[PDB]
Scaffold this active site. Structure first.
Site, PDB file in Angstrom:
ATOM      1  N   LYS A  89       5.311   5.786 -18.309  1.00  0.00           N
ATOM      2  CA  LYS A  89       6.206   5.366 -17.240  1.00  0.00           C
ATOM      3  C   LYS A  89       7.414   4.589 -17.778  1.00  0.00           C
ATOM      4  O   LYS A  89       7.415   4.182 -18.948  1.00  0.00           O
ATOM      5  CB  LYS A  89       5.429   4.571 -16.200  1.00  0.00           C
ATOM      6  CG  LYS A  89       4.376   5.394 -15.469  1.00  0.00           C
ATOM      7  CD  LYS A  89       4.248   4.908 -14.049  1.00  0.00           C
ATOM      8  CE  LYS A  89       3.894   6.031 -13.110  1.00  0.00           C
ATOM      9  NZ  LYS A  89       2.433   6.238 -13.119  1.00  0.00           N
TER      10      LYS A  89
ATOM     11  N   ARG B 186      -5.615   7.441 -15.782  1.00  0.00           N
ATOM     12  CA  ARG B 186      -4.948   8.671 -15.387  1.00  0.00           C
ATOM     13  C   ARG B 186      -3.824   8.983 -16.366  1.00  0.00           C
ATOM     14  O   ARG B 186      -2.814   8.284 -16.405  1.00  0.00           O
ATOM     15  CB  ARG B 186      -4.400   8.522 -13.977  1.00  0.00           C
ATOM     16  CG  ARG B 186      -3.751   9.764 -13.430  1.00  0.00           C
ATOM     17  CD  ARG B 186      -3.311   9.521 -12.012  1.00  0.00           C
ATOM     18  NE  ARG B 186      -2.539  10.630 -11.467  1.00  0.00           N
ATOM     19  CZ  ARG B 186      -1.227  10.775 -11.635  1.00  0.00           C
ATOM     20  NH1 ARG B 186      -0.545   9.886 -12.343  1.00  0.00           N
ATOM     21  NH2 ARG B 186      -0.597  11.807 -11.093  1.00  0.00           N
TER      22      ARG B 186
END
Lengths: 262, 262
Positions: B208, B242
């Site tokens: 991210k 995840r």
């Protein structure tokens, strides 16, 4: 939280800004010499340069007569051509003396002054930092962590008696030495205990058997496993990590540092 | 320490043996169809297969009318050809309904039932686990962690009111959503607090912005940074991660598990 810096003659290492990366120098010797040759020393300089480029803050360089003939020339070249502090990875007093004379800044003893106590005197003498690693010639522990902390303290005693200042002492739990795979995991799990002794800790787990034992993977496939140990180590307060894969480990450390707030 | 298992219809996930890996499915659509085509669904099946081979325990698959036309066919194929539980990555009630009908086992809501409360009713109805992620349409926090825990609890309330059993609830701190880079780091630093709520936590930080913000590196160069967050996450008690890079992240998790004693 460390009220001082590591003094390494020419260079100065701050213990608060970031996890410091010590790069393990590829030391492949020549089979046609007793030390000093061109392929030998050049391949080592290019490796130090590569590691310096990828984020390393320290270069680690590792019978007695030959050991000096091989290691001394590599220190002369690297200290000239790569502006980074150098540690000599020996436990021998005579070797350590030569290496610092040759330009090495830090000692990296895998026997924590127990194999050759005179090495402490060498360290106090030249006033260089010394990394004391936990080690022993047996694997019979009553209480692994309690014993490690005792054993390390027996190293600190030797260092201090010889005249080594508190500020030149760094500890090393010696993961991968004198420990079963399960014991290595246990030390990993309980690393933060070493902090109570009040010295900077260096972790050195780079691609060892226990990583392989867990993942069932040969040495060249242990970057992820090494990374996990580096992460957990930094979380548990380690000031240094000793690694082969400098580029990758340097990135994981930096990210850890940001997260833990270092 | 978890006195139960996750029930996922056909499959059963144990929360104590290991950190469970959820693989993020590559979902590249076709430009010449509104969903269902051969390159689309085949590329997704081969990716699920690859992720299943590399250590994944769950496959994550993500207007309203089209969303169903695209996602439903991928679930039918994967559930047939890859024996692993499937989560539908939507926040829409209607989408979630179709996906479970199509064979999905778990819901993965990025709005924690706040965008479409009816989704909770869908989840209670089909009796499937639901991952509630922290999210909000503003970034004005009094006390980041205190606020997150409040906000998540507003999700749990909605889920429970709709009839969702405690055992089908999983939490997600929503790292990378509604948080400045520094806030993301702070949540990372304080992740263990989510544990007091007494639910399994899933972490989802895979490549991210904040990893990029720290390392200054584009998305394709965030494997090491992702790894660091996975490690710290597991240390802080996460039951799931995840991730995109299943092979690498699966190895780091396994090594973490061995070290922390999971």
């Amino acid at each position: 939280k460390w009220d001082y810096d590591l003094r390494c003659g020419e260079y100065t290492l701050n213990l608060n800004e970031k996890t410091l990366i010590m790069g393990i120098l590829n030391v492949t010797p020549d089979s046609f010499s007793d030390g000093g040759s061109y392929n030998e020393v050049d391949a080592a300089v290019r490796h130090a340069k590569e590691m310096r480029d990828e984020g390393a803050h320290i270069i680690d360089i590792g019978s007695v007569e030959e050991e000096i003939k091989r290691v001394v020339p590599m220190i002369q070249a690297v200290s000239k051509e790569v502006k980074l502090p150098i540690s000599i990875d020996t436990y021998k007093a005579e070797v350590a003396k030569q290496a610092i004379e040759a330009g090495a800044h830090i000692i990296n003893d895998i026997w924590g002054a127990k194999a050759e106590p005179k090495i402490a005197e060498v360290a106090a003498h030249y006033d260089v930092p010394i990394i004391l690693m936990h080690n022993r010639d047996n694997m019979n522990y009553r209480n692994l962590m309690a014993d490690m902390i005792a054993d390390l303290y027996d190293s600190i005693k030797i260092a201090k008696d010889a005249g080594v200042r508190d500020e030149n002492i760094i500890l090393n739990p010696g993961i991968g030495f004198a420990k079963t795979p399960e014991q290595n995991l246990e030390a990993m799990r309980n690393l933060e205990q070493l902090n109570v002794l009040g010295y900077p800790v260096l972790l050195g787990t780079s691609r060892k058997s226990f990583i392989g034992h867990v993942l069932d993977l040969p040495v060249e496939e242990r970057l992820e496993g090494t990374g996990a140990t580096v992460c957990l180590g930094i979380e548990k307060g380690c000031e240094f990590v000793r690694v082969h894969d400098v580029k990758e480990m340097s990135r994981m450390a930096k990210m850890m540092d940001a997260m833990i707030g270092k």
